[PDB]
Design a binder for this molecule. Sequence first.
Ligand SMILES: Nc1ncnc2c1ncn2[C@@H]1O[C@H](COP(=O)(O)OP(=O)(O)O)[C@@H](O)[C@H]1O
Ligand SMILES: Nc1ncnc2c1ncn2[C@@H]1O[C@H](COP(=O)(O)OP(=O)(O)O)[C@@H](O)[C@H]1O
Ligand SMILES: [Mg+2]
Ligand SMILES: [Mg+2]
Lengths: 283, 363, 207, 168, 7, 7, 188, 372, 372
Amino acid sequence: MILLEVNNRIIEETLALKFENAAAGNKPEAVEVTFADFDGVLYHISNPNGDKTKVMVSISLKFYKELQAHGADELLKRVYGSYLVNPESGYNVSLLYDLENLPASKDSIVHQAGMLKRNCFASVFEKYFQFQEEGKEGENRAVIHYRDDETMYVESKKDRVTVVFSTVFKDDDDVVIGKVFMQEFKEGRRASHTAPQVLFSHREPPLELKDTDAAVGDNIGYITFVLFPRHTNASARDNTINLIHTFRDYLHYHIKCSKAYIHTRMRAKTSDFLKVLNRARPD
Amino acid sequence: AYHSFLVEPISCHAWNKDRTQIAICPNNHEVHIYEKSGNKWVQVHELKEHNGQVTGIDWAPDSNRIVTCGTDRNAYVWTLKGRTWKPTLVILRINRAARCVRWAPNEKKFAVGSGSRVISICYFEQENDWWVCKHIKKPIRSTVLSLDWHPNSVLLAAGSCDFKCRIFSAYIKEVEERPAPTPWGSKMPFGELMFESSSSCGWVHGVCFSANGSRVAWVSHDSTVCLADADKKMAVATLASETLPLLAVTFITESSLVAAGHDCFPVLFTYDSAAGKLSFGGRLDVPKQSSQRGLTARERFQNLDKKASSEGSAAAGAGLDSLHKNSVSQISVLSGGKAKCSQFCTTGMDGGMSIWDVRSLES
Amino acid sequence: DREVGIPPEQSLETAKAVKERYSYVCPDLVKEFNKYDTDGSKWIKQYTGINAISKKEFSIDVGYERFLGPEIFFHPEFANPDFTQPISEVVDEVIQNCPIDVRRPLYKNIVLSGGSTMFRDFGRRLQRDLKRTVDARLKLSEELSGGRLKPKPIDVQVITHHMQRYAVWFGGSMLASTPEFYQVCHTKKDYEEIGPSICRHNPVFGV
Amino acid sequence: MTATLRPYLSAVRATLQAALCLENFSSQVVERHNKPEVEVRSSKELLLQPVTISRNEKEKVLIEGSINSVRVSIAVKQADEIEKILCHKFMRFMMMRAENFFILRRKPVEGYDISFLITNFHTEQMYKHKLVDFVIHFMEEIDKEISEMKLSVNARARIVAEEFLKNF
Amino acid sequence: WXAXCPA
Amino acid sequence: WXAXCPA
Amino acid sequence: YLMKILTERGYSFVTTAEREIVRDIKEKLCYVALDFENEMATAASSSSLEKSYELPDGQVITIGNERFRCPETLFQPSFIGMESAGIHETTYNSIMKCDIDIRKDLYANNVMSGGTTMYPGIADRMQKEITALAPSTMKIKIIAPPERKYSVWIGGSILASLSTFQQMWITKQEYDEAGPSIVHRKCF
Amino acid sequence: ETTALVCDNGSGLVKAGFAGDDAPRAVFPSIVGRPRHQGVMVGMGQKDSYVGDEAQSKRGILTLKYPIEHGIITNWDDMEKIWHHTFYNELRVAPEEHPTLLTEAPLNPKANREKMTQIMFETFNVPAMYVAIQAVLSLYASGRTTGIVLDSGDGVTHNVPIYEGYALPHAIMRLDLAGRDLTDYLMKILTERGYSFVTTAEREIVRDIKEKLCYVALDFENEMATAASSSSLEKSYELPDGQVITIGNERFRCPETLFQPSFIGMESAGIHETTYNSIMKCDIDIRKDLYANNVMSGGTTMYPGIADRMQKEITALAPSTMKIKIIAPPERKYSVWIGGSILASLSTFQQMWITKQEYDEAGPSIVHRKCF
Amino acid sequence: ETTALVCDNGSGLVKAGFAGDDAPRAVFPSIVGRPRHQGVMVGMGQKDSYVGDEAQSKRGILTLKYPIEHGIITNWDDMEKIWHHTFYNELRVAPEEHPTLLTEAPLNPKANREKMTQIMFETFNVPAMYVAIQAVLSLYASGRTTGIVLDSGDGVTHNVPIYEGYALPHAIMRLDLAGRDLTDYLMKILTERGYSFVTTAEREIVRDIKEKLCYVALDFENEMATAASSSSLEKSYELPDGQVITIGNERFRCPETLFQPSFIGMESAGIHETTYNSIMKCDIDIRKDLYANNVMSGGTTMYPGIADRMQKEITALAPSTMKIKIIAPPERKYSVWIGGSILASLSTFQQMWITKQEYDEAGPSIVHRKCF
Ligand SMILES: Nc1ncnc2c1ncn2[C@@H]1O[C@H](COP(=O)(O)OP(=O)(O)O)[C@@H](O)[C@H]1O
Ligand SMILES: Nc1ncnc2c1ncn2[C@@H]1O[C@H](COP(=O)(O)OP(=O)(O)O)[C@@H](O)[C@H]1O
Ligand SMILES: [Mg+2]
Ligand SMILES: [Mg+2]
């Protein structure tokens, strides 16, 4: 994997295993499993009651309150139709599949359910882009800090949109490696034509975040991506959303991959060192 | 006059009276005997009943007996009975180890430089058919690495690793008689300290005596050479240089001196008559060695797989015979005694052997 | 060698008849050998695998391997020459090298867990062999010292259940669910300066 | 290295050559053995005083001495945290395959970087000047290795960044 | 360069 | 061979 | 390259007659691949791509991956060992070296001609490669007339038919008086 | 801490050495080559990447690529590799021991400067460094305070008018034309003759050929006419394979591209025209001094007769009432390095350096305000 | 598991031996003969099939057939029989005890490699093996890393340019002409003289005659003219029956077929022309090294004077400004085997082998990917 995927393959696999035997009579196959994914959010699949004819999926979003305050009426009918019901687990969006009714599609529904986290996350970014597109008075900027102690802020003014990232590294070992990783992020531009500007700042927080109570400290960097309609229209919106949401885990995974790469290089060099040493043993 | 007897190192060497037989420890739980064949060497016998490592051998010019003094806190006195060799158990009462051994000129007793802080002297007894052992432990405070004997056989020097090189006075009245007057002292009874080193000068790895019995010399790990002249009022002479530590001691005549060690080649010294000072002599063995190599098309590719292809066996020590002659273990003598020594031999840790001369150089 | 009609590439997929119903264990070896060599008509099965390259059907019959493979467990000498030692006798030996008070309950609880143990009638063979050997040992022990008594026979039972394919996952789940796991688990600071030796603990070591 | 490292290398090489001399000494304290004396630290009779060859605060070396063995410990010139991490990982990967070396230890001395070991069992079955030459060569090449690792990680970060930014 | 000419 | 030359 | 690979399959061709035979084979049973790796994977499942050709002697030769391997040499010159770039890269470099304003017009019009560009799917692959390399904000169009083989001859005939060109010719009198160097200055 | 190292990242060559020496201690071209074939033999796992004279020697199986193009860096990995090679393998001096001096062409992007400073301060942790301009160092080497610099390097040609104690940043002109374009045009014309050269190895071969058998022509038309009588101008060169190539008009054709950029299709003017425009844009009084002093430097201005042609062209363009003098030192190739060494040796410059403490507290933007 | 066995399936001969020895321990021709008559005597039920020196001794009542033709196997049963014979009767070493090394000519069909690997892994269940090229082993034996190989075997002649640490797979030329065609032409000409030879036994006789009384001619026309004065060139050979055959121009006629393939009617070029074309297709810089080193190997290049003729032809074709050297070791017959043994002895190669776990998993398509 290079671009971290957005479709959790666990739900895809379990739903495929369930549906491939769906047309086999009165087959309940009681299921009750708990999962976890990036952003420190817990999933849960479990039948509502003894009736096993219905399967339910739920989320435990950390910043759920902001989503509820904003209102996601768009998400209740566009991607998810009539198979969405009020929250049960922890006041967080939960859906269920009605097996008694014939499920016509097999892959489309599974794919739609696979991107649940990003599907709910987009409710704010797409709405801000709509606000700036529609000509409505620039909606008040918002700050969305997810499970990680870091913070996310967005400003949606006329003629452009903005987004800023706050980064926090826990272990002392990876702090410097991540700093080096993000140092060259703001400059690599020789292979991109229609791409947004990128900048890095750690000592001086941007003037936008002074009033906002976002991630403020000392060992915290900042990354901002300037947005323009040429790469934020109705066509190139999903790709940008996927890239930004999968930014954090992308950085993490590629840091670990670099660690493995350097491990391999040093392991290779050990052989040369041993070859040099072997000059001491006799013929 | 270099020769090789085994790739692996060799602990100690011993020779017969006619210089026709050799003793080589293979660094294993046994000892081998090599004999001359025209101008060639070949194995003859194979003696092995010791389960430990052998570290000391010696030969009797007349008795034709061989002693194996090593690990296992034991020691066997080999004797020849017809055309085969048989052991002879001995008791030494040791608890740690034993490294060096040496017989006596008159072949009546032998001493072991045990590693148990003790020095043992034994003599033959026909009553119990055994070899009784006495002990000297009064002044000793550490291991002893080198032992040498005096003509009369009453004076013993036991080098140690405690800055000292001391002469002793052992006299077993059972198999010994009163020695003639000696300048050193009074030939006091067994188990006493006669005299000690004047001061601290490195450890001790060897000792050498003189026919007149008036001069004693030893070497040290501190790149120093000493010469205890007892003829005068215990005059002591010293010398030093930049050479690496020496690990052997021997001299030719009343004034000469020879030694060798990690320098990889012999070094010669000398002693003045009245000046009470020594001097230096460089590479009395020969001027220098030579080096050579070959193409070895097979080797050119074989070495690249493990080592670098351009690599080779050439070394800076090839020119001055410092390539293969890894260190020197000890020294011996060929003809007569320590008076003229027309030829001298040395042992090597490389697993081989070599001979030299003192007159073929012809200054 | 016993058959032809398969490609070199798709060998293991052909060799996986073992995972199918295609292997039964056998109380006796030669008996079934002559049974096959006598009739050789009904006991022989057939394979109808599908090629993964040219999509051409290829078939081969099923022979003595229906039982020999699974029988190798009790006769390992066929494959590994170094280890010429059965399993059931190893079980009794290991159970006989532990204190007296524990020998009795141990024989009563032998768990059938693992993929290679899915073979049918495995438990019957192991139970019968262990019962035979233990009864023989008891009779030998009683022979030397006479007595009109009769010890209660040792009971050996093999249990068949689900979970045989995977018996480690549920154990790990219960491991995680236990709060004491969060306390016994080695911590970061332990590895920080002591080193990774914290994970070196083993059940067969101690000084 | 004439004006920067040559004198340091010459001094340490001379010290090693002088202290590379070794001999076999039957155990004096424990029954019958020939185990290394430096590690045991039983008798002060055989031990020789430690020596150090250094020119900066953060880089150092130590030279031990004994009849049976001579021990040498080095401290590398590491400045940034990345340098420390890379040196630690590289040395660990060297430890993991130290059996074939027959010279190296299995864990560095406390508070110091990697250290080596020599013995009379490794002086005859192996050549003498080659071992010191290899130790020297490692001392020089450590800086090259760390710089190469640093540029490699920088290039990896650059390439991943370039690969991600293209999608936008 | 980025715009105009290559470099 | 199959085409060209024999083998 | 096709001969070399046909050797790796098991069919040998050396002399010039077999050179013509292989030329005909390529002319008849070769095509370009939109994706090289996907085509190789589908070749791993070689049950729908292999095709047979009838030699003059009657021998039948089965050709699989070689159909879409040799044309890829155009986009991957490294196969033959030439340290150069493909046609797409060379065209991109040539267009970039031009002025900025005319780049749009050059992108909007891309004429191709010659007998080496009749492989089906070549136009689609070139379009995909150019769009991937070029910025994804404009439209790139590939024009592939079905008579590109004789386009040069048709153009020459049309140019000759032009009235204005009746005077640009080079006659014997001026050539003899001036010399052979005249043609050098005649329209470069 | 006794001296400093001056490194000139030339567009086609690298010059380095100690501060104080009159000649560089390391002169190798900027080549970062990688193997192009597969490799079969087992007894060699050698150096996946190649740099320096090694790359030049074994260029026949490598895809040579120049890290720097027309004065602006394109691949940072290659530049870091060459820096590491020069610092360790050749100089064998640790970065911490002494500081480093860097030079770059004028009117370069600030991104390159910031990235170079960040890499130097972070990777090699140099105690201090500085960034300067090649033309000012050329002035320092020439021992003059007033004049106009013709820094026609392998990648960039630029001029910077100067006056006593001050410069004129508003009269700086930079031309992308340089030796690489000349080599490309030479290859194109060598094709018209009948000799073909495409790959990078033949690029180096043609570069050597131009370095050895090229010169400028006082009059283009007269030289062409004399070439029409081609019996005394053609010269022969020996290729590595032994083939002999005869070169005629190409000797004096490619250099003329400098005075006639229209040959390559560039809508610009020649070096003479650009220098005339730059001097005219200056104040009237300093025009006399600028005319009286014209320093030139770089590896592209060693063609014999170039000075005479430039003098003739400038005098023809300039009014014919004063005297125009051209100064052509015979060591202009390393003038920049000599100037850098002299500047480093200056006592007053020992405090103008940029150290790690101030750089870390301030940031990469400090170098921007440091002498522009 | 202490050593490995290297077997060279030569087109006309088989070489085998232990890894480490400097000479092969088994050298017999590849003959698989079967009886041609009926058989009457009753005290013999002997060996319906014959192989090896036995076949050579009793060739008069057998239909000898070579299992391998021009480098490609035609009958697999014969090859398996010869493999079994060499492994058991001669070497007397079980396949399981040690691994086996195999060599084959370049540009061979993949079907042969896959079948050979499958048979070796299935029938003899060898622990491991590998497949290599004769030319690279020739380089290893010669102790060189750069040059051009002339591997003119009994069945195939091929060249493979090489450079330091890498090869050039795109400049490999394989020629079907080899010793067998020379023997056929020799038979045809011996017919024109007056001596007839048709069956395989006389084929072996003519092969021996060529091996003993053939040489190359520096100048063809001069040799023909001197043959016109046939009083010092004719030589006599003693046949097994005692008949004496006088051979004149045929001694230097058949070898010339190598330089003049048109004699047999093949529309190709000679070895000199093919080597010149192969070297020209390489990069310019490596041409000098390739010229300076020209390794040749095989049993078809032992004719005296061949090296001199090749040198003269190459120098005439190549420019006369450098030096061309021909290296002709006197042990080129077993160079391939020596190279294979040295390669096997290499420590680094102990891991490149292909084991059986490998084959337990997939049709031998693995020979190619890897092991090449
Ligand atoms: N002897 C020479 N004569 C003419 N040009 C030369 C000569 N030597 C080098 N050159 C040219 O000058 C260039 C290198 O000189 P240099 O000043 O180091 O370029 P840079 O400005 O990057 O330092 C080369 O590209 C070469 O074309
Ligand atoms: N002494 C010889 N003189 C000339 N040619 C020989 C001689 N011995 C063999 N040959 C020729 O070389 C061939 C065998 O050499 P060889 O290299 O073993 O073939 P291969 O390459 O298949 O192993 C024979 O066919 C023979 O024609
Ligand atoms: Mg420059
Ligand atoms: Mg052959």
